[PDB]
Ligand binder design. Structure first.
Ligand code: MGD
Ligand code: MGD
Ligand code: SF4
Ligand code: SF4
Ligand code: SF4
Ligand code: SF4
Ligand code: SF4
Ligand code: SF4
Ligand code: SF4
Ligand code: SF4
Ligand code: SF4
Ligand code: MO
Lengths: 193, 734, 250, 250, 193
């Protein structure tokens, strides 16, 4: 019944990868891969210099292209909006990697594919995700999008702007970026050079 | 398989990630801390943790982490890396034997004790004084904080402290001078800064570099480097001469405000703009805006202040501005930090006791006739703090006597002290050099005897007291027992202490014995302390609480705004006129600026695979237009060559503008030449190896580092091992 | 521009898999040949079935030998579920059933036209699923719709190119028709891309691409160079698109 | 959702420009048959060279006939500017030089069979350009990369369908080969689109789409059903994709 | 040598259609076709109702897909950034309409393609476009992007947010929507259904 989401305030994010390291630790993500990373991009010259710090990780898309494309049924979307992998069915075919537009998944060295889990393990026992808990700046919020009281719901309600990565794929991300620093919105590599 | 599904044991534990010492909970499963977390009651973490805190545990599970005592093969040169395993017993004897020899023909002051981190209490504060050497130092004093601590002692009667006392949550306007928050990732201040932003705190950043904190600022003033005192003097001038200052505040808590007004007569926004390069209107507007918000406008003092030789002047000036705004001790930016009450463990006085100086003769009075031999840097600058970087000369020339023998307790000799060639000459000439550490860094492997410390998670430490709005006491408990042949520093100190006649010091047979005594005092015992990891006590924060009681805090009964009658007298100047135009980079060169990576602590985190994987190298920041005239682009590498010809290993070039053309910036702590730390070895450029020279602050022992110039020489991309490959080496507790 | 950590944007399908891609082309297209042969009642239908079976076996073997989950034995789930939206699922069932269907054909058991039409349909599934395994990933700008065209035609150039080396007389004409088709669509492929994607294909590949385009032109020249040239162009093209198209890129 | 005025989102290429699409398929396809029949020395090289000249000319007339700019005579510019980026420009010259070339070949003079190489090239340009004239518009979701493949395949189904109805022995088999290639890509096309683009296609056309796919299956049955059934399928699809793809849509 | 642009502050657009009508009068745009039209869309539900009034027209993209596609050369991009049609070379083939992502182009009943012209005729005599002139709400501005005294330049600078239609396309629209009313940005039909 809830519809789970995450909101990150970019106006507060300073790109100290705390969340990224906390997830690495909490989830035991092996060395060469990451469920969460931070991208940092500057925009502009001297008198209008903006820097965008942006954590990127599974957005738990509501319309996840990473699910239908899976041959076994390992890749699945939960009734509350979590996109997960049943490693027991995963054949590590990489179809889901080809299909995710956000470089959110990887091949875990145990032979199956992995990626941010929205800390389903913590969610189930009533906790908030590791990224969310360890965050000096308090820029991430999580919750049931349907509960007007939840922290994400509130965060979105109080936001000056809301953005999502590659909205034109039609994945309906459930990781919302609040108050992006640049007037033109989230930074893309294409608006560079 | 997941750690959290597996059986866990938690404990309340301090983070040794850096010196902020956040209170954390460590979750172990067997002999391994899988996760660490902040916790709500703890006033430092309050539930959160910075990246360094989160990744800090892997050093404990690092396959290159130091395990056994080691002694230098006889006949092999220091530097050459020849060691043989030893016993704690044998290593500890070897050290005392050698130490004693130095002490019979030179005295105990011929032993310098350098150190850092929690256990520096034992090595730098306690053991040295119990042994009788005044040559005890930490880099967080003359390579960090000395300029502001001195400035603060003279201006207020108080320190700024380790948990700088800014009332961020009520601040309304904040001016950061070089203070990079968000790169500098001290937990609570990140939290606070973020909360300030959140509640509509508009932040001004002054920095020749468009940093993270600048990325959050309402105004960025891209100041010409080494020029901040001119901007501070001109703001002082605007608040005094435009009559914006807090009149009452100066009237009731300020001495000598008049000397300041006259001093600052000609330092106008137009005089400032000329050196500062910040337009005069901006200089004016910023002072007005801050006056409009008082007392809730703060220029919090930065922590790293050695920047140039004049530093104490810049801080004094910054403090005057805060005073003139009436913010000290008011809600808005400075609450009054009182130290908690935890009674010391009962002991005989130490041969040498400290002098927390500030007024009426805190220089060398006790050093002259008073017993023996004075700290070997005694005449070099005015202030009384020990300066790590000045006691190194005595080891090469034997000038002020001789310092044979040196201890390095968790202190990076080759990255935290400038002029590495001089430090290596000095280790050459020593009779004994011991280093207590965890990783095989480049300066640990120059030691006669290496002693492997147990890590913060495998260790108990004497309590951590934090002066604060609500003073508190923290306790770290082992999360599991030391690994390999690893020993806690309390134990190493005691074991050396028993071997050099200091049993009266070290009487307690165990650290929990020690910890139960202080807990007695407060009304608790060890088990209860473990129960509430941190203890908050009642204290005070504004002026009213002080004032109603009929008292005031300081040094002498009224903050002295020009700030110090006894320097005047015999040193020459009282006010911070030394805006002293800074020597400029020669053409073809850039000033070398440096700072922090949000994910790496100083140097010691460069072998951490969780953290190196987030940030595996530094990157040289050059203005886009300079890298273009040079023929440098995005993925190029470069060697940094300083004015003295030292070259620093190939660094990635970072042609994105957020920096003046005068400068170049690199994060401090890379460039290790330490093959045994397999994933930190050969990566990035070391700022310290390029910091050949420094301008001694003649007031606060500080070694001005930003006085080095560097030029870039095209280099080849480096060929290095794969970090993932190395990071994947399994950790085997053997 | 700068990261802490890194996005997982590395190649997920290696030279290893690009090989699977060339092979399933061969597999599927030879199964088509065997099907169409059984259906003309031509005598060669029997050994082409053996080959289609062999290439099906060789392809399932390297699909499994290259799978990170090769020893976790999870491919069984490929066959115990229904995932009609997934090209790889289609591919598993087409080949698989196409290998049973072609198994019975070889062993003259369980009927024989009704099995040859089956082989026909399963070999169309297997010829079709690779381009769609690429093309459904609308986030990857190089794997556009033409992949659903390039991959089936190219699988045919491989089968017929093979058939012609084995000196089957019927095939050196279809091989030139289908190779002409494939090379024309391959030449127009880059022109079908957004500028930045074409520029990306040209920087990272091309010179290989352009070499594979020229190569394949030797399919219309000397008689016994024609199948080699056609085979290498069609396989080079398939592998290059598989390796070069793993890009999300802005 | 509500407007004052209206976006100019009205159909821009009508049933008449869908008819030209079908004929330039033929014109280019037959011009290819012709040059190949030349190059090959075939007795029929002439018969088919004068057909291609008519089909080409019929189309170029339908191209001017349906242009609202006809009586303004602005087409001369199609031949007096260099515009390599423009599919349509390439088709003006490809059908123009393809005409002259086919003239100098039918009037047996200025040169022989070095001219069939030029006819082959111009026919490839003419076969290629529509397909790209659609696919070049990356704002039209339905006109994806497959158009660049579906159109040349489909133009040859048209040329070979015609050829087979004019009872040329050679035509049936390659028509049933390219018709299989055509029909299979045509089936995969919907599966290549994003879900909203596909949904649009199935509600707007489809039946029509699935009809012409079914109809085209008739190339693989009897004769004098075959060339018809494949011909109606090729022109169905061609016209319907031009008609249904003029959508911009969100 | 300048870069001509238009900015529309949607926080002030009320979608009266004055600009649209001023255009039709000036350029005597024929019945049934429009150089400029208004799109009005509600984003809904009571406490949170948002209406976006959005005037649409040729954005005179900086990288116009309608130019390259032209066989004739009638579709040309000018030295200051106007996409214009020279009707003398226009063969009314529609390639540019097919390549225009915005429906800004139409077939003029006089047999050539037409569309907004940035009021080229006025720009040379040193005047501002007719739509810009009539605007009651002062929401549209115009000028050379590179001249910082330009009304577009100053408005872009003052905007809280800047958006553009279908940025994901190649184009670099030089008509900027300023302060978009919905937090998610410019309204899209896919975001409704
Ligand atoms: N060139 C340059 N110099 C600087 C700075 C700079 O920016 N540039 N910054 C200055 C500042 S601001 C500061 S505060 C200082 C800090 O200077 P340091 O604290 O010396 O810096 P680190 O590089 O972390 O060195 C820590 C050393 O302690 C070891 N260590 C870590 N944890 C433990 C432990 O639990 N026990 C033991 N025994 N050892 C341990 C590490 O391996 C390493 O050898 O450096 C100062 N020096
Ligand atoms: N991640 C992380 N965080 C840490 C540490 C760490 O090791 N890792 N260490 C901690 C410690 S002990 C310290 S001391 C601090 C160090 O951090 P800070 O105390 O914040 O150091 P600063 O030197 O004030 O600031 C660095 C900034 O100063 C700028 N700067 C250089 N020259 C000038 C100048 O002339 N004028 C002005 N206005 N600015 C200038 C540089 O551009 C840079 O942006 O951070 C602490 N926090
Ligand atoms: S922990 Fe907070 S500040 Fe750090 S990267 Fe994550 S969101 Fe940004
Ligand atoms: S890699 Fe695993 S999760 Fe992804 S599609 Fe294949 S089987 Fe499913
Ligand atoms: S963010 Fe990645 S894993 Fe999550 S739904 Fe989207 S594509 Fe799937
Ligand atoms: S929510 Fe879970 S998977 Fe995502 S970053 Fe946090 S800990 Fe990692
Ligand atoms: S500030 Fe960060 S690194 Fe330092 S002790 Fe606290 S958590 Fe650890
Ligand atoms: S004048 Fe302004 S409010 Fe009126 S239609 Fe034009 S843009 Fe909209
Ligand atoms: S209609 Fe006119 S302007 Fe448009 S592409 Fe055709 S010739 Fe060019
Ligand atoms: S909006 Fe369309 S018609 Fe106008 S210039 Fe851009 S692509 Fe051409
Ligand atoms: S600029 Fe001129 S042509 Fe364009 S919409 Fe405005 S009035 Fe009409
Ligand atoms: Mo420091």
């Amino acid at each position: 019944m809830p519809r789970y989401a995450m909101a990150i305030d970019l106006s507060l994010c300073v790109g100290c990868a705390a969340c990224a390291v906390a997830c690495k630790m909490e989830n035991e993500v092996p060395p060469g891969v990451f469920n969460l990373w931070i991208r940092e991009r500057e925009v502009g010259e001297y008198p209008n210099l903006v820097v965008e710090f942006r954590p990127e990780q599974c957005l738990h898309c509501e319309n996840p292209p990473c699910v239908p494309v899976c041959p076994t049924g390992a890749s699945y979307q939960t009734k509350d909006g979590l996109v997960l992998v049943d490693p027991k069915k995963c054949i590590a075919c990489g179809a889901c990697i080809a299909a995710c537009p956000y470089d959110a998944r990887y091949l875990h060295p145990a032979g199956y594919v992995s990626k941010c889990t929205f800390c389903a393990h913590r969610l189930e026992k009533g906790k908030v995700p590791a990224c969310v808990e360890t965050c000096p700046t308090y820029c991430r919020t999580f919750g049931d999008l349907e509960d007007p009281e939840s922290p994400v719901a509130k965060a979105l309600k109080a936001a000056e702007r809301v953005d999502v990565l590659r909205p034109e794929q039609g994945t309906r991300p459930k990781l919302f970026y609040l108050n992006a620093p640049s007037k033109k919105g989230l930074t893309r590599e294409s608006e560079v050079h | 398989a997941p750690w959290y599904a597996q059986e866990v044991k938690s404990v309340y534990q301090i983070c040794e990630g850096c010196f902020w010492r956040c209170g954390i909970v460590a979750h172990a499963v067997g002999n391994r801390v899988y996760k660490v977390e902040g916790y709500e009651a703890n006033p430092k973490s309050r539930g959160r943790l910075c990246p360094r805190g989160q990744g800090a545990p892997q050093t404990t599970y690092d396959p290159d982490r130091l395990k056994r005592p080691l002694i230098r093969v006889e006949g092999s040169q220091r530097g050459e890396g020849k060691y043989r395993v030893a016993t704690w017993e044998e290593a500890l004897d070897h050290i005392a034997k050698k130490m004693l020899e130095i002490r019979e023909k030179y005295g105990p002051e011929a032993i310098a004790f350098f150190g850092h981190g929690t256990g520096d209490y034992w090595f730098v504060d306690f053991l040295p004084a119990a042994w009788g050497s005044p040559n005890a130092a930490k880099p967080s004093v003359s390579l960090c904080t000395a300029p502001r601590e001195v400035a603060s002692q003279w201006v207020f009667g108080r320190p700024i402290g380790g948990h700088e006392p800014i009332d961020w949550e009520n601040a309304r306007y904040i001016v950061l001078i070089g203070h990079h928050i968000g790169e500098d990732t001290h937990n609570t201040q990140l939290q606070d800064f973020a909360l300030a932003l959140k509640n509509g705190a508009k932040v001004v950043v002054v920095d020749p570099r468009f940093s993270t904190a600048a990325a959050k600022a309402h105004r960025w003033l891209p100041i010409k480097p080494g020029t901040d005192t001119a901007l501070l003097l001109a703001w002082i001038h605007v608040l005094i001469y435009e009559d914006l200052y807090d009149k009452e505040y100066v009237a009731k808590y300020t001495v000598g405000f008049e000397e300041l007004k006259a001093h600052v007569k000609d330092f106008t926004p137009e005089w400032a703009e000329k050196h500062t390069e910040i337009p005069a209107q901006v200089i004016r507007e910023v002072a007005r805006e801050m006056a409009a918000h008082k007392p809730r406008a703060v220029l919090p003092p930065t922590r790293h202040n050695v920047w140039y030789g004049d530093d104490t002047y810049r801080v004094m000036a910054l403090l005057y501005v805060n005073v003139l705004l009436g913010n000290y001790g008011r809600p808005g930016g400075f609450y009054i930090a009182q130290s908690p009450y935890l009674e010391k463990y009962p002991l005989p006085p130490l041969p040498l006791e400290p002098a927390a100086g500030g007024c009426s003769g805190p220089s060398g009075g006790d050093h002259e006739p008073e017993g023996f031999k004075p700290r070997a840097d005694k005449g070099k600058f005015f202030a009384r703090s020990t300066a790590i970087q000045e006691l190194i000369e005595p080891m090469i020339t034997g000038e002020p006597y001789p310092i044979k023998g040196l201890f390095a307790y968790g202190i990076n000799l080759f990255h935290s002290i400038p002029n590495v060639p001089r430090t290596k000459e000095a280790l050459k000439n020593l009779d004994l050099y011991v280093a207590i550490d965890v990783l095989p860094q480049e300066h640990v492997m120059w030691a006669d005897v290496i002693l492997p410390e147990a890590t913060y998670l495998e260790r108990y430490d004497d309590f951590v007291l934090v002066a604060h709005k609500t003073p508190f006491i923290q306790l770290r408990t082992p999360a599991h027992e030391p690994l390999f042949d690893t020993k806690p520093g309390w134990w190493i100190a005691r074991e050396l202490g028993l071997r050099l006649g200091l049993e009266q010091y070290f009487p307690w047979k165990t650290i929990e014995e020690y910890l139960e005594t202080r807990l007695q005092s407060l009304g608790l015992d060890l088990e209860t302390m473990k129960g509430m990891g941190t203890l908050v006590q009642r204290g005070k924060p504004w002026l009213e609480d002080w004032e109603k009681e009929g008292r005031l805090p300081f040094g002498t009964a009224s903050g002295k705004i020009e700030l110090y009658c006894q320097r005047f007298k015999e040193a020459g100047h009282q006010p911070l006129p030394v805006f002293t135009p800074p020597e400029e980079p020669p053409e073809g060169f850039y000033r070398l600026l440096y700072g922090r990576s949000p994910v790496h602590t100083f140097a010691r985190t460069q072998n951490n695979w969780v953290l190196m994987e987030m940030d595996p190298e530094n990157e040289v920041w050059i203005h886009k237009e300079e890298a273009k005239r040079l023929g440098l682009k995005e993925g190029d590498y470069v060697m940094l060559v300083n004015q003295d010809g030292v070259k620093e290993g190939p660094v990635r070039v970072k042609p994105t503008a957020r920096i003046r053309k005068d400068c170049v910036y690199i994060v401090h702590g890379f460039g290790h030449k330490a093959p045994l730390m397999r994933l930190a070895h050969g990566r990035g450029a070391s700022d310290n190896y390029l910091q050949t020279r420094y301008k001694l602050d003649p007031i606060s022992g500080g070694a001005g580092l930003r006085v080095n110039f560097v030029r870039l020489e095209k280099a080849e991309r480096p060929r290095l091992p794969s970090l993932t490959g190395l990071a994947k080496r399994p950790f085997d507790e053997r | 521009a700068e990261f802490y950590g890194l996005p997982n944007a590395q190649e997920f399908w290696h030279w290893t898999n690009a090989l699977h891609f060339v092979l399933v082309g061969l597999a599927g297209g030879v199964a088509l040949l065997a099907a169409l042969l059984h259906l003309k009642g031509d005598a060669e239908a029997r050994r082409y079935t053996l080959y289609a079976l062999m290439l099906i076996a060789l392809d399932l073997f390297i699909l499994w030998a290259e799978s990170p989950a090769r020893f976790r034995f999870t491919h069984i789930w490929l066959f115990l579920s229904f995932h009609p939206t997934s090209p790889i699922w289609w591919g598993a069932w087409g080949l698989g059933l196409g290998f049973l269907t072609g198994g019975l054909l070889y062993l003259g058991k369980g009927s024989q036209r009704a099995l040859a039409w089956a082989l026909l349909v399963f070999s169309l599934v297997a010829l079709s699923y690779p381009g769609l395994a690429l093309a459904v990933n609308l986030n990857r700008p190089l794997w556009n719709g033409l992949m659903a065209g390039l991959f089936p035609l190219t699988a045919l150039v491989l089968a017929l190119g093979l058939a012609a080396l084995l000196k089957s007389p019927w095939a050196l004409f279809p091989l030139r028709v289908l190779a002409g088709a494939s090379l024309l669509l391959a030449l127009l492929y880059p022109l079908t891309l957004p500028p930045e994607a074409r520029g990306h294909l040209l920087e990272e590949a091309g010179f290989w691409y352009g070499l594979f385009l020229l190569l394949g032109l030797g399919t219309f020249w000397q008689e016994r160079l024609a199948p080699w040239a056609g085979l290498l162009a069609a396989a080079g093209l398939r592998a290059l698109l598989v390796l070069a198209g793993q890009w999300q890129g802005l």
